[model samples]
Target: SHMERVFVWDLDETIIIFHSLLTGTFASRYGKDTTTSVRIGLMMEEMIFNLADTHLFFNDLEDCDQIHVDDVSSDDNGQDLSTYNFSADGFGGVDWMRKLAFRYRRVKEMYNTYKNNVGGLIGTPKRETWLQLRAELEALTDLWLTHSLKALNLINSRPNCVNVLVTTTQLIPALAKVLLYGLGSVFPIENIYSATKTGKESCFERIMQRFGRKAVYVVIGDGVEEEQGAKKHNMPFWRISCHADLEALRHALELEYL
Candidate 1:
């Protein structure tokens, strides 16, 4: 059956705690110790960068930070990337774009593999660091993730409903965060859109085209960008200012208000 409803989500601050951590917004708003939250956020940032540098090809794609996974390789038509020498390729132009797209493809593949083999990953090399980071982050952000995942579940459980993520963050690191934050199960690689190059409005428009005009869409985020995007497309917007807002959202959904 076709989807009757689609929920577009914003990654940072909505589903997870990245921006709020940096600015101490979460701690302040939630009445937690600001210093501890900021420190934890810093630690999480360091660990994320370390993991990306060590495993993902983040260093190589430094110049191509604005590349979007969905739009980077529009001209790349079935090119054989199996033996592509990404290292030797110089920056700029169409070839560089292809390499960036290739990196995105590899990262997406890695995310899928990691999601499928959680137990295997914990038992392999880099196990100690990965396990420690995962355990600590999960413990620290337990409530935040719990509430957000519950909202996601509420949407997912609805008949003929689908969830999609559109974030201002770049593709690779955003994908890493999804894996780190335990959101990979809900948001598959293809369902996540990085609006680094393209704006949220454009992504929303494309989503409309992909799902047909009949599907009801609701944009849920804590940012103004997504708010404007929803307005641009004439869709409903739900703002997540605090935990209470999420509760309200759940209530709204349960009562068919959304």
Candidate 2:
């Protein structure tokens, strides 16, 4: 029925502020700068979670301190000067990160923090690098997008209106704090899905399967991929970019502006 609209939310920039999460969570080097690259597509989050878990054991996750990733000397492995050392139990993180460093250029910057903050120690037992766990609240305080918040609130206000949150951020470090503090109130932890599995395409397909032809799917996001996905299925799409658009989005949600 037209009365029931299924909103597909792109969690990163569409709902919450972009890479600005770091700024809000910890005393980021960026300081007053929320300057972030595109909310880091799917791989970044997947890598982040993968990278953190590699070093942390779920059995005593909290019992641990910071995990470091040290850069290797050219003399160590005939590897690129950009090579990094990541091994606690061994060189597990070192090898994976040295490989990862080539793909994402900025990873070393964050890992550089891991090394300094970890007191020169670095390595598998790494995931979501806990050096920053101490600042989760600080990050949450400043990470939010009012337009999307308005949209989610309106969607949940209705019945039989289930909305799904699709994001590229891995569920552990990048998103767990989000659940414990930020998004938990807006959407159930279950409705949220990650691109870590494959990509948003797979996530969207599952959603389409759920409602089939009964529900009208509406895509609300700040990225091109979200727009493309919705159009691929002939669903309605809204590109939210301004405070002015919030009112229109509220109208699109079939509710009053928030």
Candidate 3:
């Protein structure tokens, strides 16, 4: 009702440290073991892909991926999926649709549980190994993860401010990564938009329409697409490259420069 603002965020290299982990630039910069960083990064990628493939019906619904899960309702033809074979090429039956919806529900709930009790997960069967991995990632990234998370927390804490994600990746994998990165609470599933089919500008237009023209929008990302989209809408674009840039972003937010 008063001075509403939407902070559109890019998922991949902007907030969470993924590209750096793959490049091993972070490890090399600090004179650490590059192989360890690469290994951790690859493990995370594998986890994301596996999570989607096994639980999210990624193989079956790959072609039907949408910005929002509900968008798949258009494909539903009201057929019973009790004996439906997912291996068949033709996509959509009431059963297949319901299964995907159910999977999305579980993903949302599991994500919430993760944010509510991350320690509960960290204390699992592979607890020690998971802890070690976390420690190594934090050190290897030079606290980039921590700083990015801190910026997110601050941005979300502001009154009348909301965070929205616009990513180029497919929906299932993006959702998987969001949960794996422990960012479930930072951005709600409803607020996450996948620009895999549509470009960032179209997503931006949709966000602007959904939030109303009165609301202020600021795009934060590490790519040119977002910058171009931001320019089209005459919105402020904050480019993030490394840890220091995130620090600057947080500082700018504090100073009301955003």
Candidate 4:
């Protein structure tokens, strides 16, 4: 009934064009009139704190970490992290949860330095600033199931295989909202994974362990981080540009099936 092969996907850009987590979609609503540093700096600041706050949902829960976090033993602004898996799944998988929370924490700490001195840096705006953006993003996002027929319909055909989503988006507290039925109609709801809450590499390792090391792993995503995670686990990587790259995926996957 189950599958020996596994397919791992990234959430934001891969599944949907939310935003690039690395340097950001590197997008800012502020526009070209705004200084590049200001735009980039503000976006980065928001994500760090937003993400830093996201880890809190897991707080007090047995599997999640504590209030404070700061451990990047293997970190090169995230490059080094892709190099290996975190501690094996145990302790409610809290060990890696700590790493995930702290990774954003330390980055947030550095951004504070920029905000402290930079002329344009907006020093940690209120929670509502992000809330408004979420509203804007939701309007800008959502409503793609009808048009996004690339991998969606194709992946669904492989019902015999297990498909999983490994994304940097928030999975807890708000997981169900963004996971459109369009995506759910294809990939099962239970297989989704969020790197924002769970460490990326750590989650990939979990997939390997769950499916067995020999299982064929396919990593489909748009971000370099996704590729890094794929390469780290020695999984094949496929590149995409939001829903736009659907046909490319269809062609390539059709070749793969052949």
lDDT of 1 by residue, 9-84 (tens): 9988888877677787676766667777777777667766655665567887654645345556565565666677
lDDT score for candidate 3 against the true structure: 0.76
lDDT (Cα) of model 1: 0.74
In candidate 1, which residue pairs get closer than 3 Å at backbone N, Cα or C atoms, i.e. clash?
none
Candidate 2: list runs displaced more than 4 Å: 1-3, 20-144, 254-258
Q: What would the per-residue lDDT of candidate 2 be over residues 1-258, giving only the tens digit for each residue?
A: 344557778766566543544434222533433333222322344444444454322222332221211222221343443344433423245565443433222333333334334322234233234334323323432433455566677788767576777776653353343432245556654466666545776678777886787777777787888788787778888886644565687775684333
Where in model 3 is the C-alpha error above 4 Å? 28-32, 73-96, 118-128, 256-258
The 0-to-1 C-alpha lDDT of every candidate, in the order given, reads 0.74, 0.51, 0.76, 0.50
Q: RMSD in angstroms, all models?
A: 3.5, 13.9, 4.2, 13.4
Shift in Å, residue 36, candidate 1: 1.9
Worst 10 residues of 4 by lDDT: 173-182
- Candidate numbers sorted by lDDT from highest down: 3, 1, 2, 4
What's model 4's overall lDDT?
0.50
Scored against the true structure, residue 189 in model 1 reaches a CA lDDT of: 70
lDDT of 3 by residue, 147-170 (tens): 888888887888778899999989
**If both were scored by lDDT, which would come out higher, candidate 2 or candidate 4?**
2
Model 4 lDDT tens row, 1-258: 344456687765556543332233324332222244344345544554444344323332324322112333333244443333434423234555555654444433333333223222323553446445444443343422333445556666764456687766554312322322224445554566667654778888877877886577888777788788888878888776644465666665555541
